[PDB]
């Protein structure tokens, strides 16, 4: 039965994503936001240790979404793919849902 996704935060600032993610305990806790610096593009923000890493959601010519190489017909599919394939080329970081107040 259909629930909204807990990871879509709309237009929050980059800094505010960092503020909220810093309070999460578990690496991989993440959100998708609408970039303020590149209106029309999404960014993915992810907790890792005491840092928060940011990734550009890239588009191909057909409008598919990707981070690195594998691309998807939806942000939803990109998110889910990266729950079991690392978002980072430097660490093993897998997307997991934020805790939630
Ligand atoms: Cl992996």
UniProtKB/Swiss-Prot annotation:
Record's comment on post-translational modification: Ubiquitinated by RNF173, leading to proteasomal degradation and inhibition of the RAF/MEK/ERK pathway. In the nucleus, polyubiquitinated by RBBP6 at Lys-56 at DNA damage sites.
Region forming the signal peptide: none
Domain SH2 stretches: 7-99
Lineage top rank: taxon: Eukaryota
Position(s), cross-link Glycyl lysine isopeptide (Lys-Gly) (interchain with G-Cter in ubiquitin): 56
Modified-residue entries (N6-acetyllysine), positions: 56
Positions in coiled-coil regions: none
Subcellular localization: Nucleus; Cytoplasm; Endosome; Golgi apparatus
Domain comment quoted from the record: The SH3 domains mediate interaction with RALGPS1 and SHB.
Entry's family note: Belongs to the GRB2/sem-5/DRK family.
Function: Non-enzymatic adapter protein that plays a pivotal role in precisely regulated signaling cascades from cell surface receptors to cellular responses, including signaling transduction and gene expression. Thus, participates in many biological processes including regulation of innate and adaptive immunity, autophagy, DNA repair or necroptosis. Controls signaling complexes at the T-cell antigen receptor to facilitate the activation, differentiation, and function of T-cells.
Known partners and oligomeric status: Homodimer. Associates (via SH2 domain) with activated EGF and PDGF receptors (tyrosine phosphorylated). Interacts with PDGFRA (tyrosine phosphorylated); the interaction may be indirect. Also associates to other cellular Tyr-phosphorylated proteins such as SIT1, IRS1, IRS2, IRS4, SHC and LNK; probably via the concerted action of both its SH2 and SH3 domains. It also seems to interact with RAS in the signaling pathway leading to DNA synthesis. Interacts with SOS1. Forms a complex with MUC1 and SOS1, through interaction of the SH3 domains with SOS1 and the SH2 domain with phosphorylated MUC1. (Microbial infection) Interacts (via SH3 domain) with hepatitis E virus/HEV ORF3 protein.
Name of this protein: Growth factor receptor-bound protein 2
Section covered of the full-length record: 54 to 154 of 217
